Amino acid sequence: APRVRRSVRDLQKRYDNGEKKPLEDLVRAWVGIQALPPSDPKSFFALGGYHGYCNHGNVLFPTWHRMYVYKLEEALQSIVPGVSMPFWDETDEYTLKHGIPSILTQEKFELDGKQIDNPLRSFVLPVALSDRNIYEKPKGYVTVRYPLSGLVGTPEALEQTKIHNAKFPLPEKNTELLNSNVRAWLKGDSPPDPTRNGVYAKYVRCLSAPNYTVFSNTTSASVWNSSNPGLVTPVESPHNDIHLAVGGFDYGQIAGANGDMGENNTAGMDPIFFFHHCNVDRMFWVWQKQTGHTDRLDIIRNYPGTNAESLNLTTPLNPFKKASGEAYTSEDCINIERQLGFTYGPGSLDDATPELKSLLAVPSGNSTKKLTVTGIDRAQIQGSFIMKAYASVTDANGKTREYYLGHKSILSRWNLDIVAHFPLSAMPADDVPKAKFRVEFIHRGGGVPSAAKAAIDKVSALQPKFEVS
Template identity: 40%
Template structure:
């Protein structure tokens, strides 16, 4: 029987509504209660299994990052986990990962027909604002049977220590036995003495669970909306979805013209930019949601305050999968992947461009060395079929017809209306009726990840002519490792770009004068890299950026500021 993955938002809502009501349950509510209890029971049992059990939560979570395996245990030239990021196998590897996790859930007695629900991250309320994280993911307790248990969807307590022994990494992601996963605004860095001291202080400031849940929901909502306030010509607010709104990125990635561009951020950056919005990959909003939940960063100019020192597990590849929310997040990512396939008539075949940078490993993964070429026949390690051969991407293209009774479908979701092929999604920018949405300029910031330890956000600002204010026009979250600077074999992967296309309408909003068809000459563009614990301003821009941060950006503190480059059109 085909599995059906349902919206966790709907299941959670109906479950708690039913538990708080004395009325008889209708069929939908009864099914929701039974389904959610099976999901919780299955994951609870996986978390109870000893770490050495193949179906234990510890073992399954460990496929993604830590505990590192093989050469990647100590060698920074290799990634010690098995996950694929920034390459064409990102969607298919994680699709197989979810199937393996779901198969393990189905080994629990009474849960043989369970399917993993998806956290519908793009669902909006009646006011067109993002819905809160499903309540079942944020409550500390869950009533299973006749007793309250620690909610296995909220957090996981390590049954075995994690040793982060990569050369030069300062043990940042070592975790002791009984470590409990955390989310924004708390910190989970406990690998060395300095981090333990900072984390103890951080978490003592945010000890109240309900308040932390409020802050987490605010942070995620801010990332999803990405509102930018521009105060000119009576325009109070405008959304530039491709660079700031995670909701927009999820929408726009569905218009990526090829699987290669759609699949990962490396290929996305090599795609030509001709119109607004520019090409967007599925991996881009995926990265942003990791950072929003992990909590290392919160927008400082929107609806929530920045909270320095938040370093939850979802914010880094090493430990993300040990937070149970990881699998519900990735289930939504896979839902969007399937929508793209349906929208582009690619439900039975996916084509990888062999000449694209994203089709080559830049660091070793599993048993595959750096520079390995990737295609639909590449082994998806460590996942094996019953005959002990590895699963491959070509085995997973049509989700409804996966061998071994693993076919599945998705229940109703917030983006279903985008599944049918039609003209590209329109830009949400609002301006004058005769505004020009044709791209006139593309601005670029290039940042070397080796300079910034851990995850960070690249940000771009525009200073209108004659004004001492900075207006944010773009940002790109970068999910990164703490030890990446030691990876000699992946130098060509260390540079990451933020590309911001500027339309005629946007330039008008910013106060640009248009002379002889030339744009962008009188606006000053600045770039910043924001991460925690750093205050290193470029000297010649120090005063202006510092004042803007304090006055207009609500205490945002960029760690490095540099001038923005022009990019020729079309960009390749």
């Protein structure tokens, strides 16, 4: 009898009908896990801190994160027995039309007699995150989302942060703009009417991934895309996009809202990290269901994405441990029903419908070909950034049509050749040989005004090379 992870809007539909305990239990557990001292390995602090070990851009991204959510849920169970971590369904109809379920964004919550602060909205750091640096965080820091900023590690950063946050004083309004930035990412244009370019399409496409390796991560998917016709999309890509939106990037040059979800430094101290990751693991389980890999996953030997030591299904996923003291491995969490005792409830995109081929279709007239972008060294850009691609055609008589080709989100950190691929399905096949390509970068611009000039100038010297197939 596996437990059932349900959508959070499901637990909310139960609250709206007077059945309160499901939501209340969950909140109670989160109040629980956030209150444990920092030395407790089940504390929210300890748990979120593990991620600042983790695996991105490699074939353990999905199973490392599967086990990660499972430990958060173990720790919640040490407080309220039998509780399940709900998923934020980011491709459901409510989110396309209204964005984030309000239980994740509400200021307060009715628990026992008491109106308490919502523990799903933010976390207050019990101790500081420092070394002895703009990404560092003082005790008492409260996590923040778009449109606010949380860069507070230097006098300069904190002052610029205050000047930034004082433009957005009303929580009700901040929440509206957040919901509005989330729906725009999802749609891929001005806000359901989804387009081929948004996060919705990227999620739909990753379920078509041909093997686990190119599904698992953006390193493998990018090399596969350099070397196979068509476009494959790793689950990691849309996962990164949700990080940037909550974490401070608009869809519609510098992103000055520096929220915790926007960078790998403290993404894990925001509780929404786990609602989102709980839904990424669900996409992963859905992709296993739909391709028949509920018990067997394969890793292509020597493939890019399979190295840090080769990375294989026996590779430990530190720091997670079985009660033996043995580390978990990817072998230990392929089948979530058999090996971990849980399953997902109903949610968006679990069925392979014909509607979800019409979206990804090359419209009649338009090109089946693909644009590859190279010669980008990201090693010197700091923080996360978005590559937006475009084609402009100059006509027979001086008329320019502009063609938006899509986006690529690089989720990164504050402290390496990058290859992007874009379909040309937005443009009519004729015009492609007659097209001048380019990429706009949206980026953190040093984060503080004292590094803006250096970061903007490294961006302006980028030398991207173009290639149609």
